[PDB]
Amino acid sequence: GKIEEGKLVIWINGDKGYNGLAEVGKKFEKDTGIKVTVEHPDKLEEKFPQVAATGDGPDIIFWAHDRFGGYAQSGLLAEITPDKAFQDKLYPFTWDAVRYNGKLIAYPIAVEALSLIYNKDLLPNPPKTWEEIPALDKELKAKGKSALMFNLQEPYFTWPLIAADGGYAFKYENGKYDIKDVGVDNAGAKAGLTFLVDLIKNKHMNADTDYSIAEAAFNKGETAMTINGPWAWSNIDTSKVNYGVTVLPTFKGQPSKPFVGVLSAGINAASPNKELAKEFLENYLLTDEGLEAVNKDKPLGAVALKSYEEELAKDPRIAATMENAQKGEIMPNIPQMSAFWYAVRTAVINAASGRQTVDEALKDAQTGSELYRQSLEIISRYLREQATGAADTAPMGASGATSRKALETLRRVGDGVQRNHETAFQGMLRKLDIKNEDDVKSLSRVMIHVFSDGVTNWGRIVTLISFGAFVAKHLKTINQESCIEPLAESITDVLVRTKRDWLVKQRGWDGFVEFFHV
Ligand SMILES: COc1nn(C)cc1C(=O)N[S@@]1(=O)=NC(=O)c2ccc3c(c2)N(C[C@@H]2CCO[C@H]2[C@@H](OC)/C(F)=C/C[C@H](C)C1)C[C@@]1(CCCc2cc(Cl)ccc21)CO3
Ligand SMILES: OC[C@H]1O[C@H](O[C@H]2[C@H](O)[C@@H](O)[C@@H](O)O[C@@H]2CO)[C@H](O)[C@@H](O)[C@@H]1O
């Protein structure tokens, strides 16, 4: 749990130009004597927050911007402070993708959007609609080909179809996200995912198709179409398939709406090499020659660097990428994106395999996606009304009946725990000696140790929240009322992170209300 001084370790995904990046690393070493190690570990976006939390991991992490808000909220990223001269060399909308709570948390590299990639030797004209793909597959099957193969294991690739007829992650209106408004189990999302499951039912696609199987089938000329990003174009070039990159097909007359990613470079908060990392990213990578080295290995898409994007913009494959991006939406970077992606990943795999119906799969994804927000509403309200003696008059909002009935249940069963276990609560309160916001930050570790490692049931969840209320009452009494919302956020994090799968299996807080129905 200590990063080594006087070198740079970089993590980037195995689908990106990591050999090109290593070439930029060699140029840095030639000037500075500092070795640059580029690694592409499996699941690096899940590994980074685990290793970084212990003061370990790479100096620089590359991922799409959507994961970076979670990393920033967890204190895992150094604030990026480039001068005006450097900032003005990149597109302002790319800087917006890496801004979190008013602070830049990464360097933007390139804009990524999925396109429809088609074999001009099999399909001279690509289909304008999803609805015509079954008929095309039937024509191509008669010739020993298939219409379409793409990765069905990552919701990134299926999302554009789910979003087409009105599926959404977090509602965006008046230039602001309603994190309370999730659109995963609406009629639009159901129509999109039913269309995908029907393609599998009718044997136009196979539920087991992943990135490697789709790429091999397209690059060998066995399938007429794939869905992929700019990074894929290198392997297609090598294959000598006569390919086009175009607009994704429409669904029910509406565009497919890909979630747009900005490949971004974050600096580990635990790195002792932050000045070397800034130098590397600003004066080696984010140059015409640095981006060219990476782009020549695996294409980046529409680069953040204006000078180089002017050259690449002339490429009709980049025009197609930006057309799809404009029909799509820039991903949020809110910490909840991780849970959203896990919930929709499971829904698509289960619907595609027949493990769940579309209705069952998207219900669970909806419950999973709103679990943090709903849990925080209940827990924050209970802690604050316990501390002050007065309830919150603010409307409950989305799924408000559940929130109201959960808080009602918690008042009954939680007050019971605090009354019956007053001596134990007082003993643990004094032993923990909670005085201020720094001490509250130390509770997460002991909550995971005591709560998360014990049996999972609603009773032990009531104790977790009820002791939280007991601590909140103390914090109010000693003029530390400012600590209660952070405490509520910390309890919610432990509960929903460590009991995610169990909570969704219970129908979340509806399960809680039913379990303690007297
Ligand atoms: C029929 O049975 C029941 N019906 N219902 C409604 C409940 C039970 C029931 O039996 N529940 S029980 O099994 N629950 C536990 O054991 C338990 C569960 C979660 C806990 C947790 C304990 N904690 C240790 C406790 C605190 C007081 O002394 C501890 C314990 O004695 C050593 C005790 F009193 C247990 C009695 C429980 C009622 C038994 C607190 C904890 C660690 C410390 C830091 C910290 C900070 C915050 Cl903000 C928030 C929480 C925490 C983690 O959360
Ligand atoms: O499938 C969910 C997944 O989608 C995005 O990941 C993309 C990434 O943006 C691309 O650069 C490329 O590597 O493919 C990935 C999909 O396999 C999100 O960025 C990611 O957080 C999310 O889990």
DSSP structure string for 247-279 = PPPBBTTB---PEEEEEEEEEBTT-S-HHHHHH
- List all residues whose CB is within 6 A of at least one atom of ligand 1: 413, 417, 421, 424-425, 428, 443, 446-447, 450-451, 459-460, 462-464, 467-468, 471, 487, 491
Beta-sheet pairing, 103-104 with 171-173: unpaired
**86-92 contact pairs (CB < 8 A, 24+):** 86/282, 86/286, 89/286, 89/305, 89/306, 89/307, 90/286, 90/304, 90/305, 90/306, 91/304, 91/306, 91/309
Distance (Å) of CA 53 to CA 35, 264, 445, 499: 25, 20, 12, 20
Residues 389 and 494 in one domain: yes
Beta bridge partners of 118: 225, 244
Within the chain, what is the greatest distance between any pair of CA atoms?
78
CA dist., res. 174 & res. 6, Å (int): 47
Indicate if ligand 2 lies below 6 Å from the C-beta of 261.
Answer: yes
Give residue 187's domain range.
115-259
* Cα distances (Å, whole numbers) of residue 495 to 127, 392, 436: 46, 22, 22
Cα separations (Å) of 133 from 18, 25, 138, 412?
A: 35, 45, 9, 56
Amino acid sitting at position 427: G
End-to-end CA separation in angstroms for the chain: 50
Q: Among 71, 60, 64, 47, which residue's Cα sits nearest to residue 285?
A: 60
Are 141 and 110 in contact by the 8 Å Cβ rule? The answer is no
Q: Strands of 115-119's sheet, edge to edge?
A: 146-148, 223-228, 115-119, 243-246
Q: Let me know: does 247 contact 241? Beta carbons within 8 Å.
A: no
Residue pointed to by tokens 């097909």? 249
Q: Is residue 437 within 8 Å of residue 483, measured between CB atoms?
A: yes
Resolution (in Å) of the shown entry?
Answer: 1.8
Which of left, alpha, beta for 330 (phi over 0: left; psi -120 to 50: alpha)? beta
Q: 417 C-alpha to center of ligand 1: Å?
A: 9
Clarify whether residues 372 and 491 are in a common domain. Answer: yes
Residues whose CB is less than 8 angstroms from the CB of residue 147 and which lie 6 or more positions away in sequence, other chains included: 127, 133, 134, 136, 137, 140, 204, 223, 224, 225
Identify whether residues 509 and 360 lie together within a single domain: yes
Tell whether 121 and 253 lie within a shared domain: yes
What span, in angstroms and rounded, lies between the C-alpha atoms of 242 and 323? 21
Q: What is the CATH number of the domain that holds 497?
A: 1.10.437.10
Q: How many CA atoms lie within 13 A of 39 on its CB side?
A: 17
Residues 358 and 464 in one domain: yes
Amino acid making up residue 15? D
Q: Which ligand is nearest to the CA of 462?
A: 1
How many other C-beta atoms lie within 10 A of the C-beta of residue 330? 19
CA of 432 to the centre of ligand 1 (A): 14
Q: Are residues 124 and 216 in the same domain?
A: yes
- As a whole number of angstroms, the distance between CA 342 and CA 158 comes to 14
Q: Name the residue of 447, 463, 471, 490 whose CB sits within 8 Å of the most ligand 1 atoms, as the mutation to test its pocket.
A: 463
Mark out the alpha helices in 53-97 (DSSP H runs): 68-73, 84-87, 92-97
DSSP string covering 18-61: HHHHHHHHHHHHHHH---EEEE--TTHHHHHHHHHTTT-S-SEE
Q: What is the CATH number of the domain that holds 126?
A: 3.40.190.10
Name 176's bridge partners. Answer: 173
Enumerate the β-bridge partners of residue 305. 90
CB atoms within 10 A of CB 336: 23
CA dihedral 426, 427, 428, 431 (to 10 degrees): 120
- Is there a single domain that holds both residue 251 and residue 362? no
Please tell me whether residue 115 adopts helix, strand or coil conformation: strand
Indicate if 362 and 510 belong to the same structural domain: yes
Residues 385 and 245 in one domain: no
How many CA atoms, within 13 angstroms, populate the side-chain half-sphere of residue 359?
Answer: 0
Q: What are phi and psi of 392, to 5 degrees?
A: -85, 125
d(CA 171, CA 340): 13
147 touches 117 (CB < 8 A): no
Which residue's structure tokens are 């195995």?
A: 14
**Distance (Å, whole) CA 393 – CA 381:** 10
Rounded distance, CA 491 to CA 479, Å? Answer: 21
HSE, CB side, 13 Å, CA atoms: give it for residue 287: 14
Q: What is the DSSP string of 402-424?
A: HHHHHHHHHHHHHHHHHHHTHHH
Q: CA of 451: how far to CAs of 59, 310, 408, 493, in Å?
A: 33, 55, 23, 12
Within this chain, do residues 372 and 472 fall inside the same structural domain, yes or no? yes
Query: Is the CB of 210 within 6 Å of ligand 2?
Result: no
Residue labelled with tokens 């720094």: 438
- The secondary element (H helix, E strand) that includes residue 210 is none
Q: How much distance in Å is there from the Cα of 65 to the middle of ligand 2?
A: 10
Q: Dihedrals φ, ψ of 404, to 5°?
A: -60, -50
Within this chain, do residues 368 and 499 fall inside the same structural domain, yes or no? yes
Same domain for 120 and 236, yes or no, is yes
HSE value, Cβ hemisphere, 13 Å, CA-based, for 214 = 25
**Residue 498: C-alpha distances to residues 76, 296, 360, 517 (Å):** 20, 42, 23, 25
CA distance linking residue 321 with residue 263, whole number of Å: 14
